[PDB]
Amino acid sequence: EKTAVVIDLGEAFTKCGFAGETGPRCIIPSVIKKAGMPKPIKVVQYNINTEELYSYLKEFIHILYFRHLLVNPRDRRVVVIESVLCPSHFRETLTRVLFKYFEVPSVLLAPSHLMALLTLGINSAMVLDCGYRESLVLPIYEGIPVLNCWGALPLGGKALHKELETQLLEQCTVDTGAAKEQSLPSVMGSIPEGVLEDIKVRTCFVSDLTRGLKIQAAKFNIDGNTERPSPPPNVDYPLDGEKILHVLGSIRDSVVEILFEQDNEEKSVATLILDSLMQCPIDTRKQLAENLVIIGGTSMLPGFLHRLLAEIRYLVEKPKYKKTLGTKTFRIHTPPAKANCVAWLGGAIFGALQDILGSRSVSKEYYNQTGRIPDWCSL
Amino acid sequence: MELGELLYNKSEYIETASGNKVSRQSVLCGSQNIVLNGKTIVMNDCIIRGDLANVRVGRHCVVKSRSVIRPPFKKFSKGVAFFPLHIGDHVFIEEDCVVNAAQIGSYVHVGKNCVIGRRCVLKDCCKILDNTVLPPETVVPPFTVFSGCPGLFSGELPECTQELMIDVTKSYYQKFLPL
Amino acid sequence: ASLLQSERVLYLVQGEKKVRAPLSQLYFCRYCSELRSLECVSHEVDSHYCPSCLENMPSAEAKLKKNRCANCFDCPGCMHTLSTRATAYYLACGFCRWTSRDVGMADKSVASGGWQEPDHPHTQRMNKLIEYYQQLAQ
Amino acid sequence: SVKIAPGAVVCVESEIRGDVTIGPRTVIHPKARIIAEAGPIVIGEGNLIEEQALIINAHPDNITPDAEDSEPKPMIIGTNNVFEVGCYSQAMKMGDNNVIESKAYVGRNVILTSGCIIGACCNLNTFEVIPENTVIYGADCLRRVQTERPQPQTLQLDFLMKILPNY
Ligand SMILES: Nc1ncnc2c1ncn2[C@@H]1O[C@H](COP(=O)(O)OP(=O)(O)O)[C@@H](O)[C@H]1O
Ligand SMILES: [Zn+2]
Ligand SMILES: [Zn+2]
């Protein structure tokens, strides 16, 4: 047998490499540069025609299997990591591309949350997945994902990128280099997603709960006269060479707060753990609480893990969660690989198990016969 | 334009000798060391300096206007000297292009206003796109396209370059006639 | 190919999937009678090579070395092939003036042999987990 | 109006205009475009110029304000300075030990220091003094990086003394 390849198709970035390795070999933006198109189209797009999606995935998988990885597709197996409740037609297409065009031996559709649990070694743990599109949580108890007690909110990368763009356009101060030393607002109508992502990573950080709670009430201005903490210094960011955008200190520590803002509904990235944990079985409560896992690149943002764990323990004392989750000890697990590449590492650890892989995985001979991929929906 | 090469009428003033046509406008300071064995074209306002050179060019070589081919200086501890470059067979240097390259391979299409760095080797059957910067001491494999300010692998070329490029340079030469 | 606009007049392929492609890109199948596209045809892997120091490596050596050249290096700041400069060797880029001295990697006495990448921090924990799951899978 | 200096291997075939002031050990390559429109072109020793290099002192043509009384704006250039292929330059004051790359458009009022390099095919029209020993790379973005040590180019210049004769 040969070392099975691991792919993990995401909206922002795709993880690729081989099984039984310390981390992924290639990690790249999930896009393709088609002739005529100035900006490259995104390879994973939900709610489009199958033929157009088929062509994009055919183009992308080709780049992964030749330019990034150097190996024959037909020779060795595949371990496709994809999140639970991934759209039906997308997963059906992705398999149909691998089985028909590339003619792979067998694909294994592992849920990202159960794979993240294997990397630690613990059999039972709560898993939060703060991705690009949606920040999803799914309790895993001793190998069994509990779909009953699922939770998701659109407070990921996409929702954060959009919030940054909005704030920058309000307090817009750019030095074009054409008598634009004076503050010039909205010279460009929209900012490209590639720039916004680079600003987010380098400039913006996650504030402490004490400082963050003041920032929330400050921008609200709820019958108070200038009750904001002192912001960090303003950082100057180059746009397309000559144009120098002066990023305000307030924007850096306020953009993140949309994730941890209550917004009346009581629906934050913090609340989603406690909302799910309260809905879980009474016996499983204390085991899941003690074993928390924080995967996804959105949680890589500096000082996110401290704010989350703090915001949890504050929301615990709130009267809604005070009865059930009152006297619970919330402890976070530190996975071996980085927060972005926890999902991938599980699939590699699973891919190294040649004996179990072949049995669990769906063979091409079965797919060609039936034409029915197994899912958590009815058969 | 749609596969077919288009007409280009040259003026009376041009040095036509043994097939090799060289525009009189285009200075080539150092005529001794530079050598053009085949039926080469050098368009107006182009430079081929003899700064301790040995500039050998192809059978059907083409260099469009405002374009420079200068040899690079090798930073050697023994002795600092200008390395003699060798342009390959059927080489197409595009307009306004800068070339400080040592050993340019055969059957290559160098793009418009693209700066190739010092001591840069190019292997046969490659293509550099327009508005691109190849840094000093870089190599580009066959059936490749290098682009961007970094100057890195963009993709692969069509399989039939060796056969196709012959038609292009020979057609341009044949189509390029006096008025 | 590009100078003359080959991407204008296109030829059609017969089969399941119909595609409009230039004749320059397409391939003729001699075994039968039907020209097929780069898309339609299946791709294989023959040989691996480094784009800087053109050295044909075997398939077995690539798997051990993780599809990389030992001698050649690419700069991290910008993406370009680095060059060894002496004073006793330091690694420097031509495009950007990023050096190996900047990050604080010590100069090596031997040219190529000395340079190395540090071992992965969670490599020991990795093998222990594989062997546990391997026994458990068995 | 020419102040030719001995030791400097300025080639006669290169084009020169206006009230020039030539340096001690400068080496000008052929088809190097130097003009002294308003004020003089002051050249430091070892300031070699390669290929196309548009060095003009035409601030009266650029703006034409009819201000600053006389406004000579004398073009001061430093020592050991490499002007590469196709690089446009127009700097009233320019420091020593700086190497602009090929096809580099330098601004109308940009002051260069030591150990500083402009990116190849990169244009900078905006007026802004360059920090001490920092390099710019790429056209798409500037992406400024501070160098460890300044780079000298003396050996190159010294060897041209031997070549230029009989050319
Ligand atoms: N190392 C990092 N540091 C900070 N932010 C990151 C990092 N890596 C990714 N991100 C951000 O977090 C997001 C993570 O998305 P990712 O988990 O890769 O995608 P998906 O959820 O589709 O699998 C990216 O879109 C990016 O904005
Ligand atoms: Zn190599
Ligand atoms: Zn670099």
- What CATH number did the domain enclosing A225 receive? 3.90.640.10
Residue A325 · residue A289 · CB < 8 Å: yes
After which residues is the backbone of chain C broken at C–N > 2.5 Å?
Answer: 87
Residue A85 per-residue DSSP state: T
Residues of chain B with Cβ-Cβ distance to C9 below 8 Å are: 2-3
3-class DSSP assignment, residue A279: helix
- Residues B128 and B116: their CA atoms lie apart, in Å, by 9
- Residues A53 and A73: their CA atoms lie apart, in Å, by 20
Residue length of chain D: 167
3-class DSSP assignment, residue B156: strand
- Which atom from ligand 1 is nearest to the alpha carbon of A8? 23
Cα distance from N-terminal residue to C-terminal residue, chain C: 56
Q: Which of C38, C133, C135 to substitute to test the interface with A, most A CBs within 10 Å?
A: C133
Residues within 8 A of C (CB atoms), B 82-121 only = 92, 109, 117-118
D124–A242 C-beta distance less than 8 A? yes
List the beta strands (DSSP E) in D31-97: 34-36, 41-42, 75-76, 81-83
Residue A139 · residue A279 · CB < 8 Å: no
For this entry, resolution in Å reads 8.2
CA of C100 to the centre of ligand 3 (A): 11
Question: Is A20's Cβ below 8 Å from some Cβ in C?
Answer: yes
- Which atom from ligand 1 is nearest to the alpha carbon of A296? 17
List the beta strands (DSSP E) in D2-159: 16-18, 34-36, 41-42, 75-76, 81-83, 98-100, 134-135, 145-146
Give helix A209-220 / helix A304-317 axis angle, nearest 10°: 80
In this complex, the chains that touch D, judged by 3 or more CB pairs closer than 8 A, are A, B, C
- Residues A59 and C38: their CA atoms lie apart, in Å, by 12
Q: Which two tokens stand for residue A47?
A: 């709610």
CA distance D127 to chain A (A): 8
Using CA positions, which residue lies closest to atom 6 of ligand 1? A297
B153–C1 C-beta distance less than 8 A? no
- Residues A47 and A87: their CA atoms lie apart, in Å, by 8
Residues of chain D with Cβ-Cβ distance to A241 below 8 Å are: 122-124, 139-142
CA distance D153 to chain B (A): 10
| Domain range for D26 | 9-167
Q: Which two tokens stand for residue B98?
A: 């800068």
Residue B49 · residue B70 · CB < 8 Å: yes
Ligand closest to A134 (CA) is 1
Beta bridge partners of C85: C90
Distances (CA, A) of A134 to A10, A197, D18: 11, 16, 67
| Overall domain count for chain D | 1
- Residues A214 and A55: their CA atoms lie apart, in Å, by 49
Burial (0-12, 13-18, 19+ Cβ within 10 Å), B38: middle
- Our mutation pick for probing the ligand 1 site, out of A201, A295, A338, counting the most ligand atoms within 8 A of Cβ, is A201
CA C80 to chain centroid, in Å, comes to 13
Q: Say if D4 falls within a structural domain.
A: no
- Residues D41 and D33: their CA atoms lie apart, in Å, by 12
Which residue type occupies A75? Answer: D
Distances (CA, A) of A55 to A7, A34, A101, C16, C45: 18, 11, 11, 14, 22
Residues of chain C with Cβ-Cβ distance to D151 below 8 Å are: 97
Q: Which residue of chain B comes nearest to D103, CA vs CA?
A: B115
Q: Say if D45 falls within a structural domain.
A: yes
Residue B57 · residue B21 · CB < 8 Å: no
Q: Say if D30 falls within a structural domain.
A: yes
Q: Which two tokens stand for residue C22?
A: 């230039």
Cα–Cα nearest to A344, from A3, A5, A2: A5
Residue length of chain B: 179
- Residues A159 and A155: their CA atoms lie apart, in Å, by 5
Evaluate the CA torsion angle A195, A201, A202, A207 in order and state its sign.
positive
Residue length of chain A: 379
Experiment used for this model: cryo-EM
- D→C interface, C-beta within 8 Å: 117, 120, 135, 137-138, 143, 145, 147-148, 151
Residue B98 · residue B111 · CB < 8 Å: no
Distances (CA, A) of C49 to A212, B60, B131, C72, D166: 53, 31, 27, 12, 46
Q: Cβ–Cβ contacts within 10 Å for residue A354, how many? A: 16
CA distance D143 to chain C (A): 9
Residues of chain A with Cβ-Cβ distance to C122 below 8 Å are: 22, 336-337
Residue A92 · residue A49 · CB < 8 Å: no
Residue B36 per-residue DSSP state: -
Widest CA span of chain C, in angstroms? 64
Q: Which residue of chain A comes nearest to D125, CA vs CA?
A: A177
Question: Is B170's Cβ below 8 Å from some Cβ in C?
Answer: no
Evaluate the CA torsion angle B22, B24, B25, B29 in order and state its sign.
positive
Q: What is the architecture, at CATH level 2, of domain B13-175?
A: 3 Solenoid (2.160)
Q: Which two tokens stand for residue A373?
A: 């991929």
- Which atom from ligand 1 is nearest to the alpha carbon of A13? 18
Q: Say if D2 falls within a structural domain.
A: no
Cα distance from N-terminal residue to C-terminal residue, chain B: 21
CA of C57 to the centre of ligand 2 (A): 10
Residues of chain C with Cβ-Cβ distance to B1 below 8 Å are: 4-5
- Residues B173 and B176: their CA atoms lie apart, in Å, by 5
Element (H, E) at A16: strand A13-18
List pocket residues of ligand 1, CB cut-off 6 Å.
A 10-13, 131-132, 157, 197, 201, 296-298, 300-301, 340
Question: Is C16's Cβ below 8 Å from some Cβ in A?
Answer: no
Instruction: State the DSSP string of A224-268.
Output: -SS--PPPPPPEEEEETTTEEEEE-HHHHHHSTHHHH--TTTT--
- Radius of gyration of chain C from Cα atoms? 24
Distances (CA, A) of B104 to A21, A96, B109, B157: 41, 45, 11, 17
- Residues A364 and A34: their CA atoms lie apart, in Å, by 30
* ∠ Cα B163 B168 B170 (to 5°): 95
Residues of chain D with Cβ-Cβ distance to B28 below 8 Å are: none
Residue D97 per-residue DSSP state: S
Cα–Cα nearest to A56, from A23, A90, A24: A90
